[PDB]
Amino acid sequence: SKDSTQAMIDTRYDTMANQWLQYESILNKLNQQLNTVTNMINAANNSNN
Amino acid sequence: SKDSTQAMIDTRYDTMANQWLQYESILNKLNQQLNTVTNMINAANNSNN
Amino acid sequence: LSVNVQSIKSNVIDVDYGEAMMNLMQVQLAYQASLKASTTISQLSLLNYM
Amino acid sequence: LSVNVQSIKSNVIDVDYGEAMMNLMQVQLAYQASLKASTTISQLSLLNYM
Amino acid sequence: LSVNVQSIKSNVIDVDYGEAMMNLMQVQLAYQASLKASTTISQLSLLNYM
Amino acid sequence: QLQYDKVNFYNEDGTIDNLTMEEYYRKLTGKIASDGENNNVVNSSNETLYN
Amino acid sequence: MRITNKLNFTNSVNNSMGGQSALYQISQQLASGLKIQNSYEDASTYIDNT
Amino acid sequence: MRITNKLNFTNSVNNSMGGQSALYQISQQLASGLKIQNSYEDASTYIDNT
Amino acid sequence: DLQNTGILQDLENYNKAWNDFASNPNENATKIALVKASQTLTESVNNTFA
């Protein structure tokens, strides 16, 4: 029971961590873009002074 | 053989460690100098205010 | 597969707000200069009656 | 044997995380520095006509 | 060896961004002031038609 | 025993080529990858000059 | 400001457009930690990797 | 009166066109972050780097 | 001649595949890509020539 217990534990979370990483990859396009425009937005604010 | 192998094993890492250290020290010039360029242009942001 | 189609579909339609804001300002501010240019035309008409 | 293949496997594929990271930073911020430079020049270009 | 060479050749081509802007600072305003000044030529003759 | 062995395939040029199976997969796949592989720089070159 | 230049402000964007995408792509390689990401980026490396 | 006025704006027109150029070449160089950008700019530098 | 990956890189690209084929003479895939990069290389020469 303990032996099987780990068998699905380790795999299931090896996944949940790993397929999360692909989300991180796509999360990066968001981060880059949101960073980019926010910096751009602040640049527009620099003109508003 | 183990100790001979162990010594050889270690040889690959001190070289590997050193070899990047050569790069790590190299990068540090860019890290400080080039971010300073980033800090300057940031200083230009502060100047625009 | 689902992850990638999402990306692909976005890439087809993607627009950057920064460029749009950027280009808008030039289009914006060039268009304003055109307004001043047009107002100059009014100032041309203003001068016919000296 | 397999560990060597794995070693070779790792040697072949894995990027130099540091070198590329800072090299990317190297190109990236200079690119970003240029990005603002472009923006400022827009204001600097557009202001003159007044 | 090659790493050293990479650095050396980089010295040959690379440039800082700061001065280019600092140089840009003087010209850009002088560019405007010159343009602003040149206008005055019209206004002086303008104020003459009065 | 076969899975170790260089097995022969009769190809579209008729050729009887001696290969492992997954190596065949590699020749087929890598060759296809080579298509876009070269084109990358090639298109960029035309991209660059056109700009 | 007729055959070469006007694109400059237009292209200043395209310069950014190309750079930002590539840098994102490179950041992903760093995030991936792999030297390459596509079968055709370096197939020889990729295929022997296979 | 006409003539001496005629000369003056014609030069400023040229001077106006000169400045916008100077401003740009700084910009493109900033885009690169490199001293120079074309073979003829310093054939020694570029072609040596080859 | 301007840090371009065209002629300058394209020639050296062959040697890389050549080297890979030298390192993996067994691997016909190198021959294919090596030859493919070859005929790619000459065409670039041919096109610029034309």
Phi, psi of F9 (to 5 degrees): -120, 140
> Three-class SS of residue I5?
coil
Tokens of G20: 């930002």
Strand partners, F10: F16
SS3 state at F10: strand
Give the Cα separation of G26 and G20 in Å (integer).
10
Q: What residues form DSSP beta bridges with H34?
A: E14
* H44-H45-H46 Cα angle (round to 5): 100
Sequence-distant (6+) residues with CB within 8 A of B12 are: none
CA distances from D12 to D20, F27, I11, I30 (A): 15, 19, 24, 16
Please list the residues that pair with F7 across neighbouring strands. F19
Cα separation, A39 vs D11, in Å, equals 38
Angle formed by the axes of helices C2-13 and A2-48, to 10°?
10
Angle, vertex CA D5, rays to CA D2 and CA D11, nearest 5: 145
d(CA I27, CA D17): 29
β-bridge partners, E14: H34
The CA distance from G34 to G28, in Å, is 9
CB spacing of H24 vs G15 below 8 angstroms: no
Q: Is C20 on the interface with A (CB under 8 A)?
A: no
3-state secondary structure labels for all residues of F7-46: EEEECCCCCEEEECHHHHHHHHHHHHHHHHHHHHHHHHHH
SS3 G36: coil
Chain C interface disruption, residue of G8, G10, G13, G23, most C CBs within 10 A: G13
Give me the count of residues in chain C: 50
> Residue E33's closest chain H neighbor by CA?
H16
DSSP bridge pairs for F18: F8
- Picking from G5, E17, B36, the residue whose alpha carbon sits closest to that of residue H34 is E17
Q: Which of E20, E21, E32 sits opposite D48 (nearest CB)?
A: E32
User: In units of Å, what resolution does this entry have?
Assistant: 6.5
Task: Tell me the residue type at B48.
Answer: N
Give the 3-state secondary structure of residue E14: strand
Write down how long chain D is.
50
G45 within 8 A of G36, measured Cβ to Cβ: yes
> Which of helix, strand or coil describes residue I43?
helix
Nearest to F25 by CA among G44, C1, G50: G50
CA–CA gap between residue E15 and residue H35 (Å, rounded): 5
- Do C and H count as touching (3 or more CB pairs closer than 8 A)? no
Upper half-sphere CA count for residue B35 (Cβ side, 13 Å) = 7
State which amino acid sits at residue C38: S
Tokens of H17: 């066109």
Q: Which of G14, G40, G47 sits opposite F36 (nearest CB)?
A: G40
Q: Are H5 and E41 in contact (CB under 8 A)?
A: yes
Residues B18, B22, B25, B27: is their CA dihedral positive or negative?
A: negative
- Three-state secondary structure of chain H: CCHHHHHHHHHHHHHHHHHHHHHHHHHHHHHHCECCCCHHHCHHHHHHHC
Residues 1-50 of E with CB under 8 A from D: 17, 20-21, 24, 28, 31-32, 35
Spatial neighbors of H11 by CB under 8 A, at least 6 apart, are none
Q: What is d(CA H17, CA G49) in angstroms, rounded to the nearest whole number?
A: 57
Answer for the pair D20, G32: CB distance below 8 angstroms, yes or no.
no
Site of tokens 């395939």:
F9
Please, is B41 exposed, middle or buried when counting C-beta atoms within 10 Å of its C-beta (0-12, 13-18, 19+)? buried
Q: Taking a C-beta distance cutoff of 8 angstroms, is the pair G16, C21 a contact?
A: no
Amino acid at C19: E
In the numeric block, which tokens belong to residue H24? 């740009």
Write down the H helix ranges in D1-50: 2-13, 17-46
What DSSP element (H or E) covers B36? helix B2-48
Q: Residue C8 to residues B49, C1, G25, H31: CA-CA distances in angstroms?
A: 41, 11, 14, 29
Question: Are G20 and A36 spatial neighbours (Cβ–Cβ below 8 Å)?
Answer: yes
Which pair of structure tokens corresponds to residue E29? 């305003």
Residue-wise burial string across C4-24, b where 16 or more C-beta atoms lie within 10 A, e elsewhere: eeeeeeeeeeeebebbebbee
Residue F29 tokens, joined: 């796949």
- Of I23, B38, H50, H33, give the one whose Cα is nearest residue G47: I23
For residues D26 and D33, the answer to whether their CB atoms sit within 8 Å is no
